[PDB]
Design brief:
Elements (H helix, E strand, L loop, with lengths): L9 E6 L2 E8 L4 E5 L21 E5 L20 H14 L6 E7 H12 L4 E9 L11 H10 L4 H7 L2 H9 L7 H8 L10 H9 L7 H14 L6 E8 L5 H7 L5 E8 L8 H15 L2
Parallel strand pairs: 3-4, 3-5, 5-6, 6-7, 7-8
Antiparallel strand pairs: 1-2, 2-4
Helix pairs in contact: 2-8
This protein binds calcium ion (CA) and chloride ion (CL).
The site of calcium ion has 3 residues, from helix 5.
EC number: 3.8.1.5
Subunit structure: Monomer.
Function: Catalyzes hydrolytic cleavage of carbon-halogen bonds in halogenated aliphatic compounds, leading to the formation of the corresponding primary alcohols, halide ions and protons.
Length: 294
């Protein structure tokens, strides 16, 4: 079903002098769900229940997002990908995941999860992905309509758009979900970002870090690395395709459709497809997991 209620209860743990929030329910091997920008663990609330009893169900809030602590002092050099990865690697380590992890990823969760998976390949049992950064991007991979806005995030205009006006939460988010969100739903997405200024910094630092047209060079290299590895890895994969979709279409989709040992389904959605087809997404993940854990 749909619903505005969160899944499970938020737990907290100290990492690098900051508290990080996460959902961790049940026993066994982890099914590890990673949200991206501008969302949180909340993104998976109607998907995680389909995996009830199939393992340990985990959804972490990235540093500065959801119920995780803000970075202090926050500024234009904080919340880089390398910074998020440092906090996330340490969190995942502290959680004692073992060596049979199923990853479920989206958006920046996919850059982070694909990267982690390449670096910890032996520990990774399966990868389910949707609307993911399969490879370094080009401006031609972006739907025409959304190009100028994303380019403006990556210019001097970005602070006003995002820190002042919360454009990523209030415009991009609902704009890339096909069904209308409820009041309670937008409230939960708005909450980490209620205040103008540095509270919203993660939602602007993220689009500045997107590996597009060669830049930033460190994130491009990481994405080129995992692109090459994923196209060769025999690790089982579930590609959840979306129609009309958003990021994972055209050339990007061409590429991830070359990856080996892969099942695919198509669901209704643009980018944040979890809000459009939760049950279809949840059911495919659960079947995938059942097949990997007979
Ligand atoms: Ca909409
Ligand atoms: Cl972004």
């Amino acid at each position: 079903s749909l619903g505005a209620k969160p899944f499970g209860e938020k737990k907290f743990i100290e990492i690098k002098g900051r508290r990080m929030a996460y959902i961790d329910e049940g026993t066994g091997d982890p099914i590890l769900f990673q949200h991206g920008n501008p969302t949180s663990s909340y993104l998976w609330r109607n998907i995680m229940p389909h995996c009830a009893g199939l393992g340990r169900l985990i959804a972490c809030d990235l540093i500065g997002m959801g119920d995780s602590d803000k970075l202090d002092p926050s500024g234009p050099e904080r919340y880089t990908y390398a910074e998020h990865r440092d906090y996330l690697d340490a969190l995942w380590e502290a959680l004692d995941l073992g060596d049979r992890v199923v990853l479920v990823v989206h958006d920046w969760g996919s850059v982070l999860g694909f990267d982690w998976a390449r670096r910890h390949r032996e520990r990774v049992q399966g990868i389910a992905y949707m609307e993911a950064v399969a490879m370094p991007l080009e401006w031609a991979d972006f739907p025409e309509q959304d190009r100028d806005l994303f380019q403006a995030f990556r210019s001097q205009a970005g602070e006003e758009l995002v820190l002042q006006d919360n454009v990523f939460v209030e415009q991009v988010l609902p704009g890339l979900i096909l069904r209308p969100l409820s009041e309670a739903e937008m409230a939960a997405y708005r909450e980490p970002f209620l205040a103008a200024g540095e509270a919203r910094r993660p939602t602007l630092s993220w689009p500045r870090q997107i590996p597009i047209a060669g830049t930033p060079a460190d994130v491009v290299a990481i994405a080129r690395d995992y692109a090459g590895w994923l196209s060769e890895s025999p690790i089982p994969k579930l590609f959840i395709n979306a129609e009309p979709g958003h990021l994972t279409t055209g050339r990007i989709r061409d590429f991830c459709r070359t990856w080996p040992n892969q099942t695919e389904i198509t669901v209704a959605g643009a980018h944040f497809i979890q809000e459009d087809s939760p049950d279809e997404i949840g059911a495919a993940i659960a079947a995938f997991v059942r097949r990997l854990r007979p």
